[PDB]
């Protein structure tokens, strides 16, 4: 069990780089295949050239958090490789390192953004249950994936889902509060507490982002789409209700509460505007998109929901791909 443990000693020469596949949390993700095994792997890391702090601390966080987490719904970091290092000349060595991840077939963003894939109710059940099982595992280890986006949600053609980029992930502690960056999640998936300036936020920040993803699979359009933080809070208020001390006692505690007020004190119209969603999912959506993070559901409670409690991981339902409609419709 130590052959696979020896890291940093292998070179990137064993991987042939196919090309770049996208932009990750801090750096761009590239694709490669191992010469020895022939396996497709996902590559991505940073550079050691900035001697201000040497090895990046945000990268050290992603290495520490990911090596502790092992789950069927989490991308497993395979190994870590380096550039060609000079013998005996380790002082002049300016070579960088590379993180080796497991490569998945597709990405949820590209599938939805193109509009080709279709999600049935059973497909969404297979999607959300795997998403919450991994999220509950990492939340159980007191870690927060502060960057839940469609580009970081990966799926294989079998139907298995995995989360990807943990570079923006930090550790959570209920006792010791550490101030964090108020802006951390993509504006379309950002929880309302971060819009209002919460620096010490709860693990419920990921539940809100996945809630916007749950509704996005039924409408094929993102729920809240705005270019500014205040405009984002307005769209959230028109659907989930305006932030008010009635539904959110500590909303006054948040700094930007008096600063960022919506136009009116809108009422919650979530169940009305989502009447086409099944009742099992609509109740889940209502709890996941709760304004107050203390009243917002947890990752385990979503797995004990009428929509996901009885879902079987054996019936892994892959998303429907068109066949001859890609050349000309029917």
């Amino acid at each position: 069990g130590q052959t696979e443990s020896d890291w940093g000693k292998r070179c990137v020469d064993k991987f042939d780089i196919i090309g770049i596949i996208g932009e990750g949390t801090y750096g761009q993700v590239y694709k490669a295949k191992d010469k020895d095994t022939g396996e497709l792997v996902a590559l991505k890391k940073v550079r050691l050239d900035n001697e201000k702090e040497g090895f990046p601390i945000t990268a050290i966080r992603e290495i520490k958090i990911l090596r502790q987490l092992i789950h069927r719904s989490v991308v497993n970091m395979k190994e870590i490789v380096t550039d060609k290092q000079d013998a005996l000349d380790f002082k002049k060595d300016k070579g960088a390192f590379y993180l080796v991840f497991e490569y998945m077939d597709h990405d949820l963003m590209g599938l939805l953004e193109s509009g080709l894939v279709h999600f049935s109710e059973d497909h969404i059940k297979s999607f959300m249950k795997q998403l919450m099982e991994g999220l509950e595992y990492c939340h159980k280890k007191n870690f927060l994936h502060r960057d839940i986006k469609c580009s970081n949600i990966l799926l294989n053609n079998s139907g298995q889902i995995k989360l990807a980029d943990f570079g923006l992930a930090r550790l959570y502690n209920s006792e010791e509060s550490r101030p964090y960056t108020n802006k951390v999640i993509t504006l379309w998936y950002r929880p309302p507490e971060l819009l209002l300036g919460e620096e010490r936020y709860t693990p419920a920040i990921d539940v809100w982002s996945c809630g916007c993803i749950l509704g996005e699979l039924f409408t094929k359009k993102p729920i809240f789409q705005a270019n500014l933080e205040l405009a984002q809070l307005e769209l959230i208020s028109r659907l989930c209700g305006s932030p008010c001390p009635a539904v959110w006692p500590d909303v006054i505690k948040l700094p930007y509460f008096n600063t960022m007020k919506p136009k009116k004190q809108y009422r919650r119209r979530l169940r009305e505007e989502f009447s086409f969603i099944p009742s099992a999912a609509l109740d889940l959506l209502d709890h996941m998109l709760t304004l107050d993070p203390s009243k917002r559901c947890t990752a385990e409670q979503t797995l004990q929901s009428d929509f996901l409690k009885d879902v079987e991981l054996s019936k892994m339902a892959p998303p429907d791909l068109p066949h001859w409609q890609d050349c000309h419709e029917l």
Binding site: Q2, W7, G8, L48, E51, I60, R61, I63, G95
Partner: protein, 248 residues
């Protein structure tokens, strides 16, 4: 999967330092010197105790793969503390650690850092990460000393005297190779075992099984008294060498 970070006492006679002509007494001194160097510098920087031990664990493991003659001790210890800060989320600038080191080191000892003290340390970070095989997560006997003491119920003053005395023994065991010989759970039990003998406390009475005279077994399984006596013998050897007496 994960690398093994534990050797036997008999294996310490074959470290890269030993095979280059260094005698066993000198390497043990170089380890105690380097450990307090990481300890004293990080203490001046106001670092958490887990950060100090993390650099010390990196330090002990590093010279199982390398020789003290080829790598300066204080340059390596500074690099360990610098990396340990970013690992345990208590980061410090490299210039701030070098400044603290020069204050507490004489001209000769700081001469190991060469003409550029920062660069000689920053360069060693690559070799440190490769040597530790990128196994950054490190556990320490502190959390187990507290996790086991919380399950003890009885005289609050007697239990607290046990904790502080055992906690003192944990700080002293960092100066030794015990960190490499045994897991942190056994060390946390051994320091409870040592502080129990010195204070003449019968810890089993404070446990949920008051007649289970081998109280530690409900904490850490498969630990013979031979291991606890071996650890206790090594910890008290530090006090007997320097002639200092038990804290008590």
């Amino acid at each position: 999967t994960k690398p093994c970070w534990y050797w036997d006492k008999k294996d310490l006679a074959h470290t890269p330092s030993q095979l280059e002509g260094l005698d066993p007494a000198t390497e043990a001194r170089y380890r105690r010197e380097g450990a307090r160097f990481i300890f004293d510098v990080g203490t001046r920087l106001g670092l958490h105790y887990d950060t100090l031990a993390t650099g010390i664990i990196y330090f002990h493991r590093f010279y199982m793969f390398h020789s003290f003659k080829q790598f300066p001790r204080y340059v390596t210890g500074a690099c360990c503390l610098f990396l340990a800060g970013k690992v345990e989320e208590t980061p410090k600038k490299c210039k701030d650690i070098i400044k603290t080191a020069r204050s507490l080191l004489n001209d000769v000892q700081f001469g190991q850092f060469g003409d550029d003290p920062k660069e000689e340390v920053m360069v060693l970070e690559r070799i440190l990460l490769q040597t530790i095989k990128f196994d950054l997560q490190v556990e320490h006997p502190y959390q187990f000393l507290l996790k086991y003491a919380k399950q003890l119920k009885g005289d609050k003053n007697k239990i607290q005297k046990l904790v502080q005395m055992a906690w003192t023994f944990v700080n002293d065991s960092l100066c030794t190779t015990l960190s490499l010989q045994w897991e942190p759970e056994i060390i946390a039990v051994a320091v409870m075992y040592l502080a129990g003998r010195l204070c003449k406390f019968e810890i089993q009475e404070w446990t949920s099984k008051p007649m289970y005279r081998r109280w530690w077994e409900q904490f850490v399984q498969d630990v013979p008294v031979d291991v606890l006596e071996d650890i206790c013998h090594q910890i008290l050897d530090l006090y007997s060498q320097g002639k200092q007496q038990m804290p008590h």
